Structure formats: structure tokens, C-alpha cells
Amino acid sequence: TEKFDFGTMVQWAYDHKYAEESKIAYEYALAAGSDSNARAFLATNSQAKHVKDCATMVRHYLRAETQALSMPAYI
Amino acid sequence: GSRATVFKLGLFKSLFLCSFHDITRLFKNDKTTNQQWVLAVFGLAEVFFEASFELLKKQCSFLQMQKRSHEGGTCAVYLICFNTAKSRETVRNLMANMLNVREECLMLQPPKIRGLSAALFWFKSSLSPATLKHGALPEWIRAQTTLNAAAA
DNA sequence: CCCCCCCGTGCGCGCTGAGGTGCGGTGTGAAATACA
């Protein structure tokens, strides 16, 4: 129940490549048996805004990571 | 009398390497009272020490004791925090009806609520094998080194 | 030389930290009570 670290949640999401909002939220809330950050997220009263921001950040990161590749390397 | 003298403190230091003035602080006024106390007693047999946890763990909100030594003199250090406050003479009579020794080897002073070593000493002692705890630690140690988020 | 009307109410949820004030956990004695 330490302060929620949005950076850690986005890191976990991009680690598992979960991008869409619903999968992020539900899969995270199901991982509260071992992640102190998960109980930290569940404790807060602004879950929807945080999941919205997490989805957007993961979207940005995947978008740029893909566009960086050159077409030979992409093939 | 025998509030706390240099002799008992010297062997206390020789055994547990931390002072009694650093875990408690000062009263030579044998009238001023307190519920919590500290104690180290000399020349005790281990059987009646184990029975000391036995006997005392009636009437105090917490009780910690740990034992030595190495071939040179035994310093059975207690941590006593009664339910109702009792003076140095009253608790002195209690413990010198407890431990079958003289009034000499008693170490009566109130514990010190602001101090780092004052709870580090007992926090280390709590992990010792012969340490015998009962219930919640008193809010002084149980404030100085704990009261931290159990699971963040 | 004294009375014939002006006048319709209160704030971003939530913090939180320096600030200082006090009756007490504990500061712990010279005075003060009574002893012999």
C-alpha cells in the first residue's frame, strides 16, 4: 500500500505488451496477490484515469519502437 | 538503593556492548514513578530466569528478557513495562522478591522514548534465541524502530 | 430644536508544514514534614 508508482505500472504493461485499456485494467487487478503496486493501484480512487493514461503511454512507446525500424531490419 | 551504578553498567557494556544511560535516562529521585522500566540483574540461574518470564508475564503490557554470559558474571537484562505504574522502591521490592539476589544488582530507570539505540538494543535482542516476548512491544521501541508500513 | 427605513448570504474535493503553546511523560531538587 505504498504510494502508487504510475511509472511501474506502465513498465509492467509495456513489459507484457498489454495495450488496450480493458486488458490492462483487468489483468493488473488480477495480479494483486504478489505486486505491492497492484494493491497500491486498487487502493486509489482514480483508477479509470490511471488506466487511461497507462494505455496512452504504452501506445506511444509501442508506436515509436515500431516506427524506428528500417524496412530491411523490419523484414 | 542501587538505582544504577558504574559497576553494573561496566559489566552490562562488557556483555551487550551498549550502555544503560543510552537505553534509559536519569532519575535518582526514588519517588518519581513510571509504568515502563528497564532491568538487568546479576547472579541469576537460568531456570529461574525462564521462570521469570513465566512469573512476570501476568501483569505487564510487554516483557522482554535476554541472558548471558562468558565465565565472568551474568547480566540477565530485562525489559519491563507494567500495567499500572509502580515506583522504584515498589518495583525494586517486586524484583528483589523475584530473583533471589541482593538489592544490589537492580537497574531501575524509566525508558527513553526519543532515542535510536534505546530501541535498537531491544530490537536486536528480540531476535535472540533466549529472548521471551509477550504481546505488543511498548510504544517507545514499537515507535522508534517499528510502526512502519507492514506491507507498504 | 428633535426620529415617518439604510439591510438579499459566503468560497475548488484534499493536503500539509512551519509555528508555538500547554499540561504531562517524565526533569529530579532545594525546601518542607516528621522522625528520633
How far in angstroms lies nucleotide C15's C1' from the CA of residue A20? 33
> Regarding beta strands B34-42 and B60-66, do their DSSP bridges make them parallel or antiparallel, or are they unpaired?
unpaired
**Residues B88-91: contacts with CB within 8 Å, 24+ apart?**
B88/B3, B88/B27, B88/B30, B88/B32, B88/B33, B89/B30, B91/B37
Provide the residue ranges of all domains of chain A, joining segments of one domain with +: 6-68
C-alpha grid cell for residue B108? 531501575
Q: Which residues contact A8 (CB under 8 A, 6 or more apart)?
A: A37
Distance between CA atoms of B3 and B25, rounded to whole angstroms? Answer: 11
Does residue A38 contact residue A29 with C-beta atoms inside 8 Å? yes
Query: What b/e readout covers B99-114, taking b as 16+ CB neighbours within 10 angstroms?
Result: beeeeebbbbbbbbee
Three-class SS string for A18-67? CCCHHHHHHHHHCCCCCCHHHHHHHHCCCHHHHHHHHHHHHHHHHHHHHH
- Check if residue B58 sits with its Cβ under 7 angstroms from strand C: no
Q: Report, in ranges, which bases of strand C sit under 7 Å from a protein C-beta.
A: 25-29
Name the residues in B2-31 having a C-beta closer than 7 Å to nucleic acid strand C: 25-29, 31
User: Does domain A6-68 correspond to CATH entry 1.10.10.510?
Assistant: yes
Going by the DSSP 8-state scheme, the letter that residue B3 receives in this structure is: -
Distance between CA atoms of B143 and A63, rounded to whole angstroms? Answer: 50
Handedness of CA A54, A58, A60, A61 (dihedral sign): positive
Residues in chain A: 75
**Solved with:** cryo-EM
The resolution of the experimental structure, rounded to one decimal in Å, is: 3.9
Distance between CA atoms of B92 and B86, rounded to whole angstroms? Answer: 9
Give the count of domains, chain B: 1
Q: What is the largest CA-CA distance in chain B?
A: 48
C-alpha angle with apex B109: B57 to B111, nearest 5 degrees?
70
How far in angstroms lies nucleotide C22's C1' from the CA of residue B77? 37
